[PDB]
Design a protein around this ligand. Structure first.
Ligand code: HEM
Ligand SMILES: CC[C@@H]1C[C@@H]2C[C@@H]3C/C=C/CC(=O)NCCC[C@@H]4NC(=O)/C(=C(O)/C=C/C=C/[C@H](O)[C@H]3[C@@H]2[C@H]1C)C4=O
Ligand code: NA
Length: 390
């Protein structure tokens, strides 16, 4: 069985995936848990994500293929399938819809300008990671959820604990307990002190309409916070890294920002992001796939970055093509667990690029590229620092 996941080399896609896509799904061994089938062919990955015989509910109570020593528990979005999943996801779908995140664009741009101001005053070189990529989306999600600004540093510390694949088992537990107790507290605050935030809406949904349990309310609050903290923070840095090493693409996006949406989608397709956070599904019945049979009770994982370069789906899949037209990438997933944050992340990535490129027309790497350090043992690929001058 193939040891998995591969060790990332920057944001290179591992060359093994090219051969993997042209054979039957492979048997893989993760750091912990059951062995699994690994699916990399685009069509095979879409099938796993859309076919209800592949279930995240069925993985609860199993010895899941995973990165960390303790199998995951919980009763929320990552643990359920329809109809129960639908009941939870319906309650969050209003606030994260494109229609309701779009009014945040002006605020996101104002925040980006404040962060860039801070970089300017601090003087060159700046670090796009610590000075911009981390603060921007963490602030925004906190505002969406009604989380006080004072808790930013504490929550980023928890995010780093969550993000490291070598966090000691007992550190994860003790910090985890503290985080959960923190969120219990916030949910009581929102109960006494209602606001125009998402958690207030979710507290009412639970404690006045009885539409979700307390355990579900808590899991959704925790999930949205953690997701908001570990995802875009890394991806913003990744996208600026890719723009900085393709300077030819910079000036088009700087001068014609209407081109930024398609570029964000191409960068979503191109960037290999998810080293560790790939939830295995368990089959609930035998499924024929890729010429093998996945028996009931077996585990299946997907490689979206590999699917996103399947040459049967994307022309010249290994080329970064910033105006790429046919781009049905799986960078936000597919099926019922399709990213509920997709419109918010999309807006954050577009605004980040628009603001940074306009504010800092002379932006460039402040160190040689070979000197960049990538985060080691991270569940999500990302830079330790991104030194820039301008
Ligand atoms: C570039 C940024 C992001 C990327 C690449 C990303 C990617 C993904 C992917 C691939 C999935 C599917 C996982 C699976 O099917 O196993 C997912 C699900 C999810 N994401 Fe995102 N995400 C991003 C930003 C966000 C943000 C900002 C939030 C919340 C504010 C968020 C919240 C969630 C949640 C709650 C789920 C589970 C949905 C469900 O099971 O119904 N994500 N994300
Ligand atoms: C970067 C883009 C996407 C953003 C989303 C963020 C979310 C991560 C939530 C993690 C929460 C966490 O670690 N909480 C502390 C321990 C509690 C419990 N114990 C576990 O071991 C565990 C997990 O392993 C959970 C794995 C979930 C993985 C999901 O794919 C990604 C998803 C990414 C694809 C648990 O939930
Ligand atoms: Na400007």
């Amino acid at each position: 069985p193939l040891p998995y996941p591969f060790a990332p080399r920057g944001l290179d896609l591992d060359p093994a995936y090219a051969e993997l896509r042209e054979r039957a799904p492979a048997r893989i061994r993760m750091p912990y848990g059951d062995d699994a089938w690994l699916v990399t062919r685009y069509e095979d990955v879409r099938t796993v994500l859309a076919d209800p015989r592949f279930s995240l509910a069925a993985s609860m109570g199993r010895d899941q293929p995973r990165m960390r020593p303790v199998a995951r528990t919980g009763a929320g979005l990552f643990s359920t399938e329809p109809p129960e999943h639908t009941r939870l996801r319906s309650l969050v779908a209003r606030q994260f819809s494109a229609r309701r995140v779009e009014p945040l664009r002006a605020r996101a741009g104002q925040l980006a300008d404040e962060l860039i101001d801070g970089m300017v005053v601090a003087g060159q070189p700046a670090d796009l990671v610590e000075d911009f990529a981390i603060p921007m989306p963490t602030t925004i999600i906190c505002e969406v959820l009604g989380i006080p600004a004072k808790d930013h540093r504490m929550l980023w510390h928890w995010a780093e604990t969550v993000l490291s694949a070598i966090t000691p088992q007992e550190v994860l537990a003790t910090e985890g307990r503290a985080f959960v107790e923190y969120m219990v507290g916030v949910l009581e605050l929102r109960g006494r002190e209602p606001g125009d935030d998402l958690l207030t809406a979710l507290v009412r949904a639970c404690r006045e309409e009885g539409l979700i349990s307390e355990e579900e309310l808590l899991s959704i609050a925790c999930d949205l916070l953690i997701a908001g903290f570990v995802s875009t923070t890394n991806q913003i840095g990744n996208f600026f890294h890719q723009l900085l090493v393709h300077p030819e693409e910079l000036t088009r996006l700087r001068e014609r920002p209407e081109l930024i949406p398609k570029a964000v989608e191409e960068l979503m397709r191109y960037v290999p992001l998810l080293t560790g956070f790939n939830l295995a599904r368990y089959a609930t019945a035998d499924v024929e796939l890729g010429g093998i049979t996945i028996r009931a009770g077996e585990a299946v994982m997907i490689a979206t970055a590999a699917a996103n370069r399947d040459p049967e789906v994307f022309q010249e899949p290994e080329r970064l093509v910033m105006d790429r037209g046919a781009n049905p990438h799986i960078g936000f997933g597919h099926g019922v667990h399709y990213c509920v944050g997709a419109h918010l992340a999309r807006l954050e990535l577009q605004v980040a690029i628009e603001r940074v490129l306009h504010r800092l027309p002379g932006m460039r790497l402040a160190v040689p590229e070979s000197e960049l350090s990538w985060k080691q043992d991270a569940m999500v690929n990302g830079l330790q620092a991104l030194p820039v001058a301008w």
